[PDB]
Symmetry: C2
Subunit: 377 residues, 2 copies
């Protein structure tokens, strides 16, 4: 039909209007300076996104989750991880960075900003609830797993570089409180001291053999804790989950004054998110970053492999009806912002992820509309 | 009672929560740089305030205005202008700058950001409609009159300084297109050429006698047009008024897609306005700028003279019932932002206006609550 297409367009165009307004304000009309845009982006990331996430999570009911949908979403990621492990361990071309980038491209779409309105327009409010559950799972688990992988890579790099031969007998790690990351952007020095028994201890502070897995486990856990304790998204997710649990357990209603206090800043989340995405689009030197072959490979992976593995897993478990379609449409969404930020901070193929987010936001309307039409027959 | 007090507090606290959040982010937790705050303020002023004003104006019905309320609001300003004229012309202590500052302090409260929610909570939606009408009148007329006065002062200063003796016989003024203001922040040079008949013409370009009023009228009109053509508020007000007229004449409904496109950025108006006010509060070196005596004089004028002249005019015309109270409560609101911006750009007592806006926002809750209680007996 065409009325449903008009409803989908009505839902999706205002986001693009905000994006184009920001793009023109920076590129055509020359209104905002780069550092002013940085300040707007900082405000958005610190305030508008965490409050929107809190508002979405604290309304979701954790006692009415759809088990099979979560099972399919987890099964596709298990399939992807298995494929990556087999490719990396049993082929000379495999690498950890490529595995991380492929996992991010093929398994982490943008569900918060764009997924909820588009899926609500396409199928209804139950699709919105499913997107909320997916966002909750993504925030609690998959972002934590990405951080685990990034911290493991950083720790491996530090161990390999600092102790090419001495790292054989290391058993303990010490890190000062001033250390916040293992990216390498700062001056990290590890003093070494001989133990009484004969082993060697190392202390990490700010200015090819493997030790046993226990010490890496401890170090990675410490780093992951130190970075989760200083991230607004973790606080938003945890507080929202706890409040949702208690409120749907004891039917407790939040005070109206606190609700309005949260909403007065939560109401700016979607428009400011799209505006900041437009600012990011305008600040880039050119729309396509990596190049023709790399960009077409990334776009093909994002818009084909994700839907393909989603279909395989969904018919494998037994998803049927509109739910199945929802999964496929969820798989074809543009790639998320949080993995892009992670790739920027750890500098693991940031150009490919930037091409992903921006060009996917640009060309998701034709691709998602085509998916909707084909699944509509 | 106390339930009505709780409702008023519920309406007003979230604004202060946003303000305090911004103040702490800049002062306590040190999140935003001064230029990032400037970028946020620029975004707010360019986008969020004009769109909020457009949304409010385009919904108002211009065929159902309350004539007597507008008559009282205009009568108080006529009284103030008459008092200022008598004081300035017939006393050696009178001045134009003092008259402008007193008029701004005593006649221009903040009705858009704070007046509408507070008055809706206090008295109902009809109070909101009255505040919308007041905002429309303020945007169309009184801001234009302020600009007329400021441009007249600038033209007088330029004429007096450039031609202490030659300005007697000037008859025509020419201004190049690059000139945007008469503030003096730029290099303004006025070439003089002798006419064929014998008079002298002057051309203004960017690097005690009075001429007849026609030439000042022409020059001031040209400058006012050149500045109204480059102000988002004028476009917002004009387009909103035209759309409201046609839509309430022919019962035309705006397309839903355009409505959502406007609303996605209009929804951030109130929270971002309060956030920017908090940023302004945090960026100042100290809360009180002018000093103890000047601040107490300005605050006393704002919170006593305005209500007093409002009462005089309202009982003079014959306002009775809650409407009368509304006027008084409208007169005790904190002083507006647009006159403060005007005073900043023309540098006419900016410290007093800054003290006005900030300290009035701080202590309007006790004063307005006291007014509500006393008028409630």
């Amino acid at each position: 039909s065409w009325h449903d297409l008009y409803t989908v367009l009505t839902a999706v165009i205002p986001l693009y209007v905000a994006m184009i307004l920001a793009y023109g304000s920076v590129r055509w009309w020359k209104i905002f300076s780069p550092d002013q845009c940085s300040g707007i982006n900082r405000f958005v990331a610190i305030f508008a996104v965490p409050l929107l996430s809190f508002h979405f999570i604290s309304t979701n009911n954790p006692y009415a989750m759809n088990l099979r949908f979560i099972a399919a979403d987890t099964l596709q990621k298990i399939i992807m991880l298995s494929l990556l492990v087999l490719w990396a361990n049993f082929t000379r071309s495999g690498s950890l960075e490529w595995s991380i980038t492929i996992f991010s491209l093929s398994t982490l779409p943008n569900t918060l900003v764009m997924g909820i309105p588009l899926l609500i327009a396409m199928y209804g409010e139950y699709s919105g609830s499913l997107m909320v559950q997916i966002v909750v799972l993504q925030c609690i688990i998959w972002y934590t797993l990405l951080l685990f992988l990034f911290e493991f890579r950083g720790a491996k790099m530090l161990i390999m570089e600092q102790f090419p031969e001495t790292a054989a007998s290391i058993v303990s790690f010490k890190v000062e409180s001033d250390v916040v990351s293992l990216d390498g952007h700062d001056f990290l020095e590890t003093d070494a001291e001989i133990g009484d028994d004969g082993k060697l201890h190392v202390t990490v502070r700010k200015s090819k053999n493997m030790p046993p897995a226990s010490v890496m486990t401890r170090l990675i856990l410490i780093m992951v804790w130190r970075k989760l304790i200083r991230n607004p998204n973790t606080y938003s997710s945890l507080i929202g989950l706890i409040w949702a649990l208690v409120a749907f357990r004891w039917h407790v209603a939040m005070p109206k004054i606190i609700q309005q206090s949260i909403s007065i800043l939560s109401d700016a989340g979607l428009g400011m998110a799209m505006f900041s995405l437009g600012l990011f689009m305008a600040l880039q030197p050119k729309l396509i970053a990596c190049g023709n072959s790399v960009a077409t490979f990334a776009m093909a992976v994002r818009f084909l492999t994700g839907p393909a593995v989603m279909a395989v897993a969904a018919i494998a478990i037994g998803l049927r009806g509109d739910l199945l379609r929802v999964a496929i449409v969820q798989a074809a969404l543009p790639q998320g912002i949080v993995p892009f930020v992670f790739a920027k901070e750890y500098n693991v193929h940031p150009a490919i992820l930037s091409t992903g987010v921006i060009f996917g936001m640009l060309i998701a309307l034709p691709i998602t509309l085509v998916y909707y039409i084909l699944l509509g027959l």
